[PDB]
């Protein structure tokens, strides 16, 4: 159970701004897209 994940080129890491930080105009679009995706990719799966 000592598994530790490895960061690589295939792995893309993006910071998710918090609810307070989501009020920013630049971050608002990213927050909305992440929130929509969190439900879409979880319920509808993926086309492939």
Curated annotation (Swiss-Prot):
The record marks 48 as: Coordinates Mg(2+) for interaction with Complement factor B Bb fragment (CFB). It comes from the Eukaryota. Disulfide bonds join 22-31. The lineage of its organism: Eukaryota, Metazoa, Chordata, Craniata, Vertebrata. Transmembrane segments: none annotated. Glycans are attached at residue 2. This is Complement C3c alpha' chain fragment 2. Residues 19-44 are annotated as: Interaction with CFP/properdin.
